Amino acid sequence: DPMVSKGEELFTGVVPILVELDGDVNGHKFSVSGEGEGDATYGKLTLKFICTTGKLPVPWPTLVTTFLMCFARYPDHMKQHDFFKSAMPEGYVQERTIFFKDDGNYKTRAEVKFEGDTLVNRIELKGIDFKEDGNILGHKLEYNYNSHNVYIMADKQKNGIKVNFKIRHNIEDGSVQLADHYQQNTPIGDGPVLLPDNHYLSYQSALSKDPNEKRDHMVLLEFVTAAGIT
């Protein structure tokens, strides 16, 4: 299928990635840069993020979902359902509202596209209605991350997809902070795209620190695999 080819020929080996985020949460301004690489053959992402404006005013875990679904591993039998690659290289817009239970919300707009050989994710994030001293602005979330299925459905009237899912962030006292994700993606270009059957992406995420890094930062290792169409 020459449409599948086109995505194949783009994601076949290791692809360098760049991520840029401008954020404002309750007027706490910050910028983040990230660099790394993805290998969609294995559903594998390796990234390192740096707060270039000093201290990050929110917990690193709360930004993981914001900081590359085109790197998912789609099994051979599911290749007709891979919206994200099909949009490349012109790319897609990924927009979310993230509702933190009993706290504020993030609203994010990203453009994910190639710039030459490099796969770029440029994001603007606005946070509003956060509690000063809540779990987010009060830095009460553990530096870890749970595995999670993400359910994708076609958004046929918009030539894109809708994605809906819950993330539970471990709080230091042993409880959990719900972050309810609402997501829409739409191609940037005017060309055709693969609109998928309902399926899900399986995520695992591991957060660590670079021992030689003095700046505020996050090392993220992610594996992502499409499933749910046998």
Curated annotation (Swiss-Prot):
Q: What is the effect of changing V176A?
A: In mut2.1; shifts fluorescence lifetime from 3.03 to 2.50 ns
Kindly state the tissue distribution recorded for this protein. Answer: Photocytes.
Phenotype for I171V: In EBFP1.2; shifts the excitation and emission spectra to shorter wavelengths and increases quantum yields compared to BFP
On whether Nucleotide-binding is a keyword of this UniProt record, the answer is no
Q: What is the effect of changing S175G?
A: In GFPA; leads to enhanced fluorescence at 37 degrees Celsius. In Venus; leads to yellow fluorescence, improved maturation and reduced environmental sensitivity
Highest taxon above the source species: Eukaryota
* Listed InterPro entries: GFP, GFP-related, Green_fluorescent_prot
Q: How is it modified after translation?
A: Contains a chromophore consisting of modified amino acid residues. Maturation of the chromophore requires nothing other than molecular oxygen.
- Describe the effect of H148D: In Cerulean; leads to improved quantum yield, a higher extinction coefficient and is 2.5-fold brighter than ECFP
State the protein's name: Green fluorescent protein
Protein's organism: Aequorea victoria
